[PDB]
């Protein structure tokens, strides 16, 4: 009864978002036509946290699927689990965002955000007592970034006591899949430093780094990368759907991690990621997952955690394990590695243990680090972008759509302000 409705924004958000319903419905015995064919009652006893219910023994997800072009939504119904979404919630338009943040924020998505805020609030008034919202998008384009930023400011000003999530595969230096990629990103953190409860930042550069080095996956398509993300969107909503010897909901990890009200960019990584060759030679135990949460190789975001200082660490486990051995191994790390951990916070790890594991795995774990290594993902975009605003490299495709030159120096100052609040608390 702490239900959360889901939003999927853009081509990046829909492919990430449609995988999350392919894995959660597999966690709850639900066939591709939506009905129940499960095996336990623990599947069905909190299925009403991401679902409505319809007559006849069928459940529909509480997801609204948003776009500006109608091409991507044909691809989601043509997917294997596309039948389960209610057709009233597919909300989209006629023309495209142009890979412009500005043309998807000011011009085009404004005629469509009235329509989204009618099918969003139909979900939010049918709830028992609503808990949160979700959003999946990328910080490098028009539909993911631009209108997906506008929708957040309208959810927040009407529901400012709920909890809010955001997912982001933020742009990278070494890979580059848009030439206006820093103009989209640097402007769009303006409403993620001020106007969100949470935001996870993931990097497509280090998605490839896990897939070649840890999993030995020879050619990873975008199917396997989105599988690697969807086991961490699952991992935060585990104590909300399943029992535990210790519990950690959404609100608990909101309070404990975030120290100061504008430092909420996190660094996820699933623990028992392992390859098919070394699955048979490897032992799962609670020390052994802690060895693999914490190393700089399995971080999904492409920053090196041993270049800054950890502030707080979460670890949302999954399985029947001993509560000494969970708490033994966090005393282990802070006293072994003690330079990398912050000095004025004495117990730096929040822990939690669930009961029902991911399917097939006897044990699993997750990790949500908050480090001062995140400034090299903000400062590195800053010189990536300020090379271009010196000569006004692309501005006539944004300035001509309704905005002026002061709104980048307003949002470069704020981008530098976030970097300045890490070298404060890091040293």
């Amino acid at each position: 009864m702490r239900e959360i409705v889901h939003l999927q924004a853009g081509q990046c958000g829909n492919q990430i978002g449609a995988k999350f319903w392919e894995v959660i419905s597999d966690e709850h015995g639900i066939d591709p036509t939506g009905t129940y064919h499960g095996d336990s009652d623990l599947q069905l006893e909190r299925i009403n946290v991401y679902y409505n219910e319809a007559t006849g023994g069928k459940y529909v997800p509480r997801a609204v699927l948003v776009d500006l072009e109608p091409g991507t939504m044909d691809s989601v119904r043509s997917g294997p689990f596309g039948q389960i979404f209610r057709p009233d919630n597919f909300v989209f338009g006629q023309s495209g965002a142009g890979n412009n943040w500005a043309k998807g924020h000011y011009t085009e998505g404004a005629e469509l955000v009235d329509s989204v805020l009618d099918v969003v609030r139909k979900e939010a008034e049918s709830c028992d007592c609503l808990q949160g919202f979700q959003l999946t998008h990328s910080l490098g384009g028009g539909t993911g970034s631009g209108m997906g930023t506008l929708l957040i400011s309208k959810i927040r000003e009407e529901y400012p006591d709920r909890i809010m999530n955001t997912f982001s595969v933020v742009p990278s230096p070494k890979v580059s899949d848009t030439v206006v990629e820093p103009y989209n990103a640097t402007l769009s953190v303006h409403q993620l430093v001020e106007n969100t409860d949470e935001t996870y930042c993931i990097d497509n550069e280090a998605l490839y780094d896990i897939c070649f080095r840890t999993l030995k996956l020879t050619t990873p398509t975008y199917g396997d990368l989105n599988h690697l993300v969807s086991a961490t969107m699952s991992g935060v909503t585990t104590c909300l759907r399943f029992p535990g010897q210790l519990n950690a909901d959404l609100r608990k990890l909101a309070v404990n991690m975030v120290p100061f009200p504008r430092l909420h960019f996190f660094m996820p990584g699933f623990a028992p990621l392992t390859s098919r060759g070394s699955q048979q030679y490897r032992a799962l135990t609670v020390p052994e997952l802690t060895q693999q949460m914490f190393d700089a190789k399995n971080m999904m975001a492409a920053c090196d955690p041993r270049h800054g200082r950890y502030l707080t660490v979460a670890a949302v486990f999954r399985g029947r394990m001993s509560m000494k051995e969970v708490d033994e191994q966090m005393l282990n790390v802070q006293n072994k590695n003690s330079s990398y951990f912050v000095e004025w916070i004495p117990n730096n790890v929040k822990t939690a243990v669930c009961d029902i594991p991911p399917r097939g795995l006897k044990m699993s774990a997750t990790f949500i680090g908050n480090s001062t290594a995140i400034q090299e993902l903000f400062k590195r975009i800053s010189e990536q972008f300020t090379a271009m605003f010196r000569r006004k490299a692309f501005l006539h495709w944004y300035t001509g759509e309704g905005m002026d030159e002061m709104e980048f120096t307003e949002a470069e100052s704020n981008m530098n302000d976030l970097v300045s609040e890490y070298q404060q608390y890091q040293d």
Binding site: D41, L42, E45, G56, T285, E325
Partner: protein, 84 residues
Amino acid sequence: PHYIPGYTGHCPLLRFSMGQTYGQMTGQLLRGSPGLAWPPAHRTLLPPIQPLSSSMVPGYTGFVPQAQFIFAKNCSQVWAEALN
């Protein structure tokens, strides 16, 4: 086989039926539900029931097979589950 009236959670097809107590209607759903496939391996409504291994001393320091994945038990109990 019913849930007691203060129970919070999901039961199938409560929201359409009417005019009955929670325990009576929950008994009616768990008895008759032909449309939905009720699962066989269900772990909630428990039945009420009342509330070598000795060839080595409790201080033995050596390797015992399969006995680092067992927990919450004594030395003799973990060795009993590892062997037998």
